[PDB]
C-alpha cells in the first residue's frame, strides 16, 4: 500500500501532462509532455522510482500497459505493472477531480509563468502543500517513514 | 537542517548534469540540461521544492546565486537562497566524490540506456537505493518525518 502509485494522464492547451498519484497520500509528481507514448511513460516512471519506493503502479491506459518500454523501464526498476482497471468505481472520480482541481490551479498561475510547463510544477507545488489538517506531502512522508519501521 | 539542500553542477560528454543533495541524508535529485542558466536553474528548484519541503539551497555558484529568474523562483517556492561556500572546507571534497560516484554509475549503466538523461536517471536510482545499514531515500524519509511530528 505505502507502495502504490497511479498514472493518470490529463490534456490542457492541446498538450499532455502525465501524473503519478501516491494512491495512500495524494501526493503527485507531473510532467508536461509532447505526446504519451511508451517511452516518455518509461522515463517518467524511471525518474519517479529513482525518487520514492515505487512497488506497484497503477497504469493509466492499455497502451502503456503492453509498451515495451514501459515493461522495461519497470523491470529495470523493480516496479511490478498493473492495470488501473477502478474495479473499485468511485477512482475514477477521485482521479477525475484532480485533474479538475490541478487545472484550475494552472489557470490561477498562467499571469506568473510564460510556459504551461512551468505552471504544471507550480500546480504540483500548491497541491503537495495544500492542507486539507495534513497536506499530501506529510502524508507520504509519514507513511513511508511507518513502513520502514 | 531537514529543509537544506545543496546544489552540485557536473559534466558529462559535453553535456551538463544538475544535482540538489538533501544535506543530512545524500538523496538526491538531478538533471541533464543543454546549459547552466538561470532560467534552467529555477525551472529545476521549482520541481524539487514541489516534491519535497526544501527551506534553504545552496546555490552552485555565483550566477545562479545572482541570476534574477533563480530569485523569482526562490521567492514564489519560499526557499531562502544562500551562497554554497565550503566554510567547513570537507564539504568540496564530499561533493566531488559524490560527482565521481555518479559519473562511475552512469558508465556501468550506458549498454543499457541510448540517452545520457536516462543513464543519470538510473544513477539517481542506484545511488538514493544504495544501502550504505540505511539508503539515502530511507535517511530523508526519517530525517522529515522526525522533524514533522
Ligand atoms: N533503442 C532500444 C533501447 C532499448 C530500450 O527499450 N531501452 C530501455 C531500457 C530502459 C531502462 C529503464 C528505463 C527505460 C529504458 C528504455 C530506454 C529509454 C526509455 C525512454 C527514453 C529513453 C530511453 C533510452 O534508451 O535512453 O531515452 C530518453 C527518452 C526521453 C523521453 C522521450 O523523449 O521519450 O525516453
Ligand atoms: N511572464 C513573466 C516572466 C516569467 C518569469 O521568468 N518569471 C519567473 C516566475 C517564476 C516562478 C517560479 C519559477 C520560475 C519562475 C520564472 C518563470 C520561468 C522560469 C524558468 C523557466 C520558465 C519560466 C516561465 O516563464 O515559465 O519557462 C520554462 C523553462 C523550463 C524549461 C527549461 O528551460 O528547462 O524555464
Redesign the pocket.
Known sequence: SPGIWQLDCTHLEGKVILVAVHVASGYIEAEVIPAETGQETAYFLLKLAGRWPVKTVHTDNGSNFTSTTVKAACWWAGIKQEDGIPYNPQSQGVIESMNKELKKIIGQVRD????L??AVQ?AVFIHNHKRKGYSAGERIVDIIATDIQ
Open positions: 506568473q509563468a510564460e510556459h510547463k512551468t507550480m
